[PDB]
Scaffold this active site. Structure first.
Site, PDB file in Angstrom:
ATOM      1  N   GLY A 133      20.835   6.574  -7.820  1.00 59.96           N
ATOM      2  CA  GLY A 133      21.764   5.504  -7.463  1.00 59.96           C
ATOM      3  C   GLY A 133      23.021   6.019  -6.788  1.00 59.96           C
ATOM      4  N   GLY A 151      14.698   7.414  -8.952  1.00 58.54           N
ATOM      5  CA  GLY A 151      15.543   7.553  -7.768  1.00 58.54           C
ATOM      6  C   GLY A 151      16.989   7.785  -8.156  1.00 58.54           C
ATOM      7  N   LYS A 175      20.040  -2.743   0.987  1.00 58.32           N
ATOM      8  CA  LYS A 175      20.124  -4.138   0.546  1.00 58.32           C
ATOM      9  C   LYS A 175      21.033  -4.916   1.476  1.00 58.32           C
ATOM     10  CE  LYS A 175      20.195  -2.228  -4.202  1.00 58.32           C
ATOM     11  NZ  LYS A 175      21.139  -1.082  -4.020  1.00 58.32           N
ATOM     12  N   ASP A 204      18.714   4.993  -3.712  1.00 57.88           N
ATOM     13  CA  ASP A 204      19.067   3.569  -3.692  1.00 57.88           C
ATOM     14  C   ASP A 204      20.461   3.409  -3.099  1.00 57.88           C
ATOM     15  OD1 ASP A 204      18.404   0.730  -4.726  1.00 57.88           O
ATOM     16  OD2 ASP A 204      20.472   1.091  -5.412  1.00 57.88           O
ATOM     17  N   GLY A 217       0.795  -1.216   0.000  1.00 59.34           N
ATOM     18  CA  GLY A 217       0.000   0.000   0.000  1.00 59.34           C
ATOM     19  C   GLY A 217       0.841   1.285   0.000  1.00 59.34           C
ATOM     20  N   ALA A 218       2.161   1.219   0.051  1.00 57.58           N
ATOM     21  CA  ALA A 218       3.015   2.405  -0.050  1.00 57.58           C
ATOM     22  C   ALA A 218       3.238   2.778  -1.512  1.00 57.58           C
ATOM     23  CB  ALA A 218       4.359   2.115   0.641  1.00 57.58           C
ATOM     24  N   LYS A 219       3.531   4.053  -1.710  1.00 56.09           N
ATOM     25  CA  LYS A 219       3.826   4.577  -3.026  1.00 56.09           C
ATOM     26  C   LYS A 219       5.319   4.837  -3.179  1.00 56.09           C
ATOM     27  CE  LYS A 219      -0.699   6.301  -4.205  1.00 56.09           C
ATOM     28  NZ  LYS A 219      -1.515   7.537  -4.293  1.00 56.09           N
ATOM     29  N   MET A 220       5.923   4.309  -4.226  1.00 60.39           N
ATOM     30  CA  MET A 220       7.358   4.391  -4.477  1.00 60.39           C
ATOM     31  C   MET A 220       7.641   5.328  -5.624  1.00 60.39           C
ATOM     32  SD  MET A 220       9.809   1.147  -5.279  1.00 60.39           S
ATOM     33  CE  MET A 220      11.580   1.202  -5.359  1.00 60.39           C
ATOM     34  N   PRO A 221       8.482   6.354  -5.446  1.00 56.70           N
ATOM     35  CA  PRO A 221       8.828   7.257  -6.571  1.00 56.70           C
ATOM     36  C   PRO A 221       9.475   6.470  -7.721  1.00 56.70           C
ATOM     37  CG  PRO A 221       9.467   8.237  -4.456  1.00 56.70           C
ATOM     38  CD  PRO A 221       9.154   6.764  -4.182  1.00 56.70           C
ATOM     39  N   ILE A 222       9.036   6.754  -8.941  1.00 58.89           N
ATOM     40  CA  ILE A 222       9.526   6.001 -10.108  1.00 58.89           C
ATOM     41  C   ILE A 222      10.910   6.405 -10.540  1.00 58.89           C
ATOM     42  CG2 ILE A 222       7.209   5.426 -10.860  1.00 58.89           C
ATOM     43  CD1 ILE A 222       7.517   7.420 -13.139  1.00 58.89           C
ATOM     44  N   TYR A 275      28.262  -0.729  -0.825  1.00 67.14           N
ATOM     45  CA  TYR A 275      28.792   0.448  -1.545  1.00 67.14           C
ATOM     46  C   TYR A 275      29.724   1.266  -0.675  1.00 67.14           C
ATOM     47  CZ  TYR A 275      24.799  -0.574  -4.705  1.00 67.14           C
ATOM     48  OH  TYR A 275      23.835  -1.202  -5.496  1.00 67.14           O
ATOM     49  N   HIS A 331      20.184  -8.556  -1.738  1.00 65.19           N
ATOM     50  CA  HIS A 331      20.946  -7.915  -2.826  1.00 65.19           C
ATOM     51  C   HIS A 331      21.201  -8.871  -3.994  1.00 65.19           C
ATOM     52  CE1 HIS A 331      24.127  -4.513  -3.315  1.00 65.19           C
ATOM     53  NE2 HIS A 331      23.674  -4.898  -4.523  1.00 65.19           N
TER      54      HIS A 331
HETATM   55  N1  LIG Z   1      20.985  -4.354  -7.248  1.00 61.39           N
HETATM   56  C1  LIG Z   1      22.142  -4.460  -7.878  1.00 61.39           C
HETATM   57  O1  LIG Z   1      22.798  -5.502  -7.976  1.00 61.39           O
HETATM   58  C2  LIG Z   1      22.661  -3.221  -8.565  1.00 61.39           C
HETATM   59  C3  LIG Z   1      22.151  -1.966  -8.261  1.00 61.39           C
HETATM   60  N2  LIG Z   1      22.577  -0.876  -8.980  1.00 61.39           N
HETATM   61  C4  LIG Z   1      21.986   0.463  -8.610  1.00 61.39           C
HETATM   62  O2  LIG Z   1      21.671   1.141  -9.808  1.00 61.39           O
HETATM   63  C5  LIG Z   1      22.371   2.417  -9.837  1.00 61.39           C
HETATM   64  C6  LIG Z   1      22.579   2.858 -11.282  1.00 61.39           C
HETATM   65  O3  LIG Z   1      23.448   1.916 -11.976  1.00 61.39           O
HETATM   66  P1  LIG Z   1      25.004   2.188 -12.222  1.00 61.39           P
HETATM   67  O4  LIG Z   1      25.581   0.847 -12.515  1.00 61.39           O
HETATM   68  O5  LIG Z   1      25.594   2.964 -11.110  1.00 61.39           O
HETATM   69  O6  LIG Z   1      25.099   3.010 -13.573  1.00 61.39           O
HETATM   70  P2  LIG Z   1      24.243   4.039 -14.492  1.00 61.39           P
HETATM   71  O7  LIG Z   1      23.777   3.243 -15.649  1.00 61.39           O
HETATM   72  O8  LIG Z   1      23.287   4.780 -13.665  1.00 61.39           O
HETATM   73  O9  LIG Z   1      25.440   4.946 -15.032  1.00 61.39           O
HETATM   74  C7  LIG Z   1      26.187   5.815 -14.140  1.00 61.39           C
HETATM   75  C8  LIG Z   1      27.213   6.541 -14.969  1.00 61.39           C
HETATM   76  O10 LIG Z   1      26.561   7.413 -15.925  1.00 61.39           O
HETATM   77  C9  LIG Z   1      27.059   8.739 -15.782  1.00 61.39           C
HETATM   78  N3  LIG Z   1      25.960   9.654 -16.056  1.00 61.39           N
HETATM   79  C10 LIG Z   1      24.857   9.876 -15.252  1.00 61.39           C
HETATM   80  N4  LIG Z   1      24.011  10.738 -15.756  1.00 61.39           N
HETATM   81  C11 LIG Z   1      24.587  11.120 -16.960  1.00 61.39           C
HETATM   82  C12 LIG Z   1      24.154  12.035 -17.915  1.00 61.39           C
HETATM   83  N5  LIG Z   1      23.026  12.771 -17.831  1.00 61.39           N
HETATM   84  N6  LIG Z   1      24.982  12.204 -18.992  1.00 61.39           N
HETATM   85  C13 LIG Z   1      26.119  11.500 -19.092  1.00 61.39           C
HETATM   86  N7  LIG Z   1      26.600  10.594 -18.227  1.00 61.39           N
HETATM   87  C14 LIG Z   1      25.772  10.439 -17.154  1.00 61.39           C
HETATM   88  C15 LIG Z   1      27.635   8.808 -14.386  1.00 61.39           C
HETATM   89  O11 LIG Z   1      28.652   9.813 -14.303  1.00 61.39           O
HETATM   90  P3  LIG Z   1      28.873  10.788 -13.029  1.00 61.39           P
HETATM   91  O12 LIG Z   1      28.430  10.035 -11.815  1.00 61.39           O
HETATM   92  O13 LIG Z   1      30.357  11.063 -13.112  1.00 61.39           O
HETATM   93  O14 LIG Z   1      28.068  12.021 -13.313  1.00 61.39           O
HETATM   94  C16 LIG Z   1      28.194   7.378 -14.189  1.00 61.39           C
HETATM   95  O15 LIG Z   1      29.481   7.282 -14.803  1.00 61.39           O
HETATM   96  C17 LIG Z   1      23.590   2.135  -8.990  1.00 61.39           C
HETATM   97  O16 LIG Z   1      24.300   3.305  -8.610  1.00 61.39           O
HETATM   98  C18 LIG Z   1      22.987   1.343  -7.833  1.00 61.39           C
HETATM   99  O17 LIG Z   1      22.285   2.284  -6.990  1.00 61.39           O
HETATM  100  C19 LIG Z   1      23.502  -1.002  -9.980  1.00 61.39           C
HETATM  101  C20 LIG Z   1      24.066  -2.227 -10.275  1.00 61.39           C
HETATM  102  C21 LIG Z   1      23.657  -3.340  -9.532  1.00 61.39           C
HETATM  103  O1  LIG Z   2      25.870  -5.487  -6.489  1.00 61.51           O
HETATM  104  C1  LIG Z   2      25.794  -4.229  -6.738  1.00 61.51           C
HETATM  105  O2  LIG Z   2      24.895  -3.503  -6.477  1.00 61.51           O
HETATM  106  C2  LIG Z   2      26.919  -3.596  -7.634  1.00 61.51           C
HETATM  107  N1  LIG Z   2      27.898  -4.579  -8.068  1.00 61.51           N
HETATM  108  C3  LIG Z   2      27.696  -5.494  -9.037  1.00 61.51           C
HETATM  109  C4  LIG Z   2      28.763  -6.342  -9.107  1.00 61.51           C
HETATM  110  C5  LIG Z   2      28.919  -7.568  -9.977  1.00 61.51           C
HETATM  111  C6  LIG Z   2      28.371  -8.790  -9.228  1.00 61.51           C
HETATM  112  N2  LIG Z   2      27.982  -9.866  -9.842  1.00 61.51           N
HETATM  113  C7  LIG Z   2      27.548 -10.810  -8.902  1.00 61.51           C
HETATM  114  C8  LIG Z   2      27.053 -12.069  -9.198  1.00 61.51           C
HETATM  115  F1  LIG Z   2      26.950 -12.487 -10.472  1.00 61.51           F
HETATM  116  C9  LIG Z   2      26.634 -12.884  -8.162  1.00 61.51           C
HETATM  117  F2  LIG Z   2      26.100 -14.102  -8.474  1.00 61.51           F
HETATM  118  C10 LIG Z   2      26.713 -12.544  -6.836  1.00 61.51           C
HETATM  119  C11 LIG Z   2      27.237 -11.289  -6.554  1.00 61.51           C
HETATM  120  F3  LIG Z   2      27.332 -10.865  -5.279  1.00 61.51           F
HETATM  121  C12 LIG Z   2      27.656 -10.420  -7.577  1.00 61.51           C
HETATM  122  S1  LIG Z   2      28.239  -8.818  -7.490  1.00 61.51           S
HETATM  123  C13 LIG Z   2      29.695  -5.863  -8.089  1.00 61.51           C
HETATM  124  C14 LIG Z   2      31.018  -6.315  -7.771  1.00 61.51           C
HETATM  125  C15 LIG Z   2      31.659  -5.631  -6.729  1.00 61.51           C
HETATM  126  C16 LIG Z   2      30.982  -4.521  -5.981  1.00 61.51           C
HETATM  127  C17 LIG Z   2      29.713  -4.096  -6.414  1.00 61.51           C
HETATM  128  C18 LIG Z   2      29.131  -4.781  -7.488  1.00 61.51           C
END
Ligand SMILES: NC(=O)C1=CN([C@@H]2O[C@H](COP(=O)(O)OP(=O)(O)OC[C@H]3O[C@@H](n4cnc5c(N)ncnc54)[C@H](OP(=O)(O)O)[C@@H]3O)[C@@H](O)[C@H]2O)C=CC1
Ligand SMILES: O=C(O)Cn1cc(Cc2nc3c(F)c(F)cc(F)c3s2)c2ccccc21
Length: 316
Positions: free
Chosen positions: A19, A17, A78, A44, A10-15, A49, A111
């Site tokens: 990273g 965010g 996470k 996020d 029932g919460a609303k999440m901004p589309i 991180y 995560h």
């Molecule tokens: N659950 C998971 O396993 C994972 C979660 N995530 C989440 O998703 C987020 C986003 O993904 P992420 O992999 O970081 O990469 P993104 O695809 O969001 O790309 C980030 C890069 O794009 C650059 N950038 C941002 N905006 C612009 C723009 N308007 N023009 C040009 N370049 C731009 C940034 O530069 P700069 O910062 O120098 O401006 C940075 O180098 C992560 O930060 C994390 O919060 C990501 C991977 C895995």
């Molecule tokens: O995780 C983030 O958000 C960002 N992020 C993404 C990756 C690559 C991964 N690839 C895997 C994978 F395939 C697994 F099966 C398990 C695992 F934990 C990782 S983690 C990563 C590696 C180091 C630090 C952040 C990372």
């Protein structure tokens, strides 16, 4: 287009965010303060991180400045892979709460589906370079996540990087109390995820798209790798709409009813990336962007491919 999507609690999440993966500790406080000033309400985060304390400083300052109230923010973190054992989940959540300086999280995700040996190292490796698993399975970690909802530490729980059979395993869990609210997965025009997104949305699970710009700052990038920001076909769609390529790449998932979390530490780009609510991609543009899929995945580590719960052997 509405700015928030309804979750199954029932919460609303901004589309949209912000990273924070790879945002340096000396730059992320300012990035989050600027993001809140220009309208972001969803951040996020993750313990792995190594910057949650600095994210927390920004949030606390903007709450003190009365720029925003806590109820208007949507804060996500996470559970890292070395804390899958049921007796470790609460303490991992409380460390994140302590660093972010919050008394609850809006959403807490598993995560990755893979549990690793507990300890100080985030990626415990054996002498040949394989990650050391733990003897944990995703259903017992889920039950520990459910307890955090009942104790009031988190308002919703979800998953990240789960394939559809792993989602099904939770949905079929004996005694399931809370369904996953979100699955956060990699998604962009080179990895469009159609089958998994329709799987999830049909089940009432909201999908968040990570790495929507293709993660050009990922540490393992190679000069020969593809670049979404420089693809001339995407540049041409951007030019037709008088928007930047990043703005098209952010609007694309929004029109698929996904949440999207671009990362930046650059103030100008943080503001650019928010200016995506005043144009629309046509149906033809959407189908064209979907056609660019190449099943090109940027977040997947070789050292984890022999883990029993590695998610990416399955087709989806
Ligand atoms: N659950 C998971 O396993 C994972 C979660 N995530 C989440 O998703 C987020 C986003 O993904 P992420 O992999 O970081 O990469 P993104 O695809 O969001 O790309 C980030 C890069 O794009 C650059 N950038 C941002 N905006 C612009 C723009 N308007 N023009 C040009 N370049 C731009 C940034 O530069 P700069 O910062 O120098 O401006 C940075 O180098 C992560 O930060 C994390 O919060 C990501 C991977 C895995
Ligand atoms: O995780 C983030 O958000 C960002 N992020 C993404 C990756 C690559 C991964 N690839 C895997 C994978 F395939 C697994 F099966 C398990 C695992 F934990 C990782 S983690 C990563 C590696 C180091 C630090 C952040 C990372």
């Amino acid at each position: 287009m509405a700015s928030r999507i309804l979750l199954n609690n029932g919460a609303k999440m901004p589309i949209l965010g912000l990273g924070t993966w790879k945002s340096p500790p000396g730059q992320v406080t300012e990035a989050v303060k600027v993001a809140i000033d220009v309208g972001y309400r969803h951040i996020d985060c993750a313990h792995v991180y190594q910057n949650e304390n600095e994210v927390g400083v920004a949030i606390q300052e903007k709450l003190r400045e009365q720029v925003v109230k806590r109820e208007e923010l949507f804060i996500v973190s996470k559970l890292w892979c070395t804390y899958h054992e049921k007796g470790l989940v609460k303490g991992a959540c409380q460390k994140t709460l302590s660093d972010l300086k919050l008394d609850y999280l809006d959403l807490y995700l598993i995560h990755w589906p893979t549990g690793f040996k507990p300890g100080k190292e985030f990626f415990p490796l054996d002498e040949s370079g394989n990650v050391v698993p733990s003897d944990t399975n995703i259903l017992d970690t889920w039950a520990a996540m459910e307890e955090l909802v009942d104790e009031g530490l988190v308002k919703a729980i979800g998953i990240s990087n789960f394939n559809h059979l792993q989602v099904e395993m939770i949905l079929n869990k004996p005694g399931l109390k809370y369904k996953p609210a979100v699955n956060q997965i990699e998604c962009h025009p080179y990895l469009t995820q159609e089958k998994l997104i329709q799987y999830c949305q049909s089940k009432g699970i909201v999908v968040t798209a990570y790495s929507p710009l293709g993660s050009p700052d990922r540490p393992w990038a190679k000069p020969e790798d593809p670049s979404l920001l420089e693809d001339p076909r995407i540049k041409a769609i951007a030019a037709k709409h008088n928007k930047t390529t990043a703005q098209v790449l952010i609007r694309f998932p929004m029109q698929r009813n996904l949440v999207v979390i671009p990362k930046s530490v650059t103030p100008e780009r943080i503001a650019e990336n928010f200016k995506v609510f005043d144009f629309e991609l046509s149906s033809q543009d959407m189908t064209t962007l979907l056609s660019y899929n190449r099943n090109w995945r940027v977040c997947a580590l070789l050292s984890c491919t022999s883990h029993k719960d590695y998610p990416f052997h399955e087709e989806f």
